[PDB]
Design a protein around this ligand. Structure first.
Ligand code: NA
Ligand code: NA
Ligand code: NA
Ligand code: NA
Length: 329
DNA sequence: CCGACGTCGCATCAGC
DNA sequence: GCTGATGCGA
DNA sequence: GTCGG
């Protein structure tokens, strides 16, 4: 449907969502509003009343009431008021900086730090992650065209294979499903020498991050441990041409025996994962991001089943293998 | 009425 | 110093 | 805020 159908309603619900999360610190209310906005965004009809909307799963009495108010006046008194509140609007805004959550944002606003400029003047009060979030505030809010993602992938697959031709790397997320743009790059990494019961050699991930920094693809590090890296990268600039914006990239090292459950999971979509998990249970299986296990007649999960491919997972549950392209739900 | 609402790796805080 | 809790992002 | 046991 077109954003013009119920875009006013969905934007309203989404704005309310942020304030719940970033200001009132009510994560479940944040998710209730998003769920409502999502179900409405998918509704192929221009909503005429709150009652009509209440029929959708996730829209209850209160949101129905807010929709009625929005339809009759074109606005919502509570949202209008919070939008004008200097304190709340500032807290909400600061959370847009990666590394600054509801707590840090509240803390900053409390002591008078309300804008990016203010943050700029108070470096010593920002942890490492927050400094990077500030530094690339704008770049991080830009999406990544599929063409750039392909170029990013070329570099990641090439450097990884260069470190050890036995590594197996897979760029997941919506990009793997074929999306035209991405918000970041999610790379799942594995190596035959690493299994659930094998040595976790604290350098399989390090060696890959290192090479990527060596060829100057990775430019900054937000966090990095033995199994997960979260950083920033940037495609090499075309000589005599505008430089590419910095991008967020995460790299996860996963045991080989859990690699494919990981790829399926991190490929999504979220709606698809929910359905697949459902089908799995009714078929006597429990599927999480790590493994797939058989459920006994009493409900006791047995040992994880061997998975050597995504298809293996689909087979266990008697489901035809579906391309990432068709995993929208 | 009233609890659930995905979980977990990493960085950093809070307490001992 | 070490252990557990919290913040944060995904 | 919404759902549901
Ligand atoms: Na409803
Ligand atoms: Na943030
Ligand atoms: Na944010
Ligand atoms: Na080799």
């Amino acid at each position: 449907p077109q954003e013009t159908l119920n875009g006013g309603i969905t934007d309203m619900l989404t704005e309310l969502a942020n304030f719940e999360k970033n200001v009132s610190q009510a994560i479940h209310k944040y998710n209730a509003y998003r769920k409502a906005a999502s179900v409405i965004a998918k509704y192929p009809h221009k909503i005429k009343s709150g009652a009509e909307a209440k029929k959708l799963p996730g829209v209850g009495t209160k949101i129905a009431e807010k929709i009625d108010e929005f339809l009759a006046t074109g606005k919502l008194r509570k949202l209008e008021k919070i939008r004008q509140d200097d304190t709340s609007s500032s807290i909400n805004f600061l959370t847009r900086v990666s590394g600054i959550g509801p707590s840090a944002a509240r803390k900053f606003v409390d002591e008078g730090i309300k804008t990016l400029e203010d943050l700029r003047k108070n470096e010593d009060k920002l942890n490492h992650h927050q400094r990077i979030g500030l530094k690339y505030f704008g770049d991080f809010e830009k999406r990544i065209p599929r063409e750039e993602m392909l170029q990013m992938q070329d570099i990641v697959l090439n450097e990884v294979k260069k470190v050890d031709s036995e590594y197996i790397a897979t760029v997941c997320g919506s990009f793997r499903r074929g999306a035209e743009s991405s918000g970041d790059m999610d790379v799942l990494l594995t190596h035959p020498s690493f299994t659930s019961e094998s040595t976790k050699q604290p350098k399989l991930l390090h060696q890959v991050v290192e090479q990527l920094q060596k060829v100057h693809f990775i430019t900054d590090t937000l966090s990095k441990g033995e199994t997960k890296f979260m950083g920033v990268c940037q495609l090499p600039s075309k000589n005599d041409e505008k430089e590419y914006p910095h991008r967020r990239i995460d790299i996860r090292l996963i045991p080989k025996d859990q690699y494919y459950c990981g790829v399926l999971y991190f490929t999504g979509s979220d709606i698809f994962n929910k359905n697949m998990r459902a089908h799995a249970l009714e078929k006597g299986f429990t599927i999480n991001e790590y493994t797939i296990r058989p459920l006994g007649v009493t409900g006791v999960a047995g040992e994880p089943l061997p998975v050597d491919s995504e298809k293996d997972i689909f087979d266990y549950i008697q489901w035809k293998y579906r391309e990432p392209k068709d995993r929208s739900e």
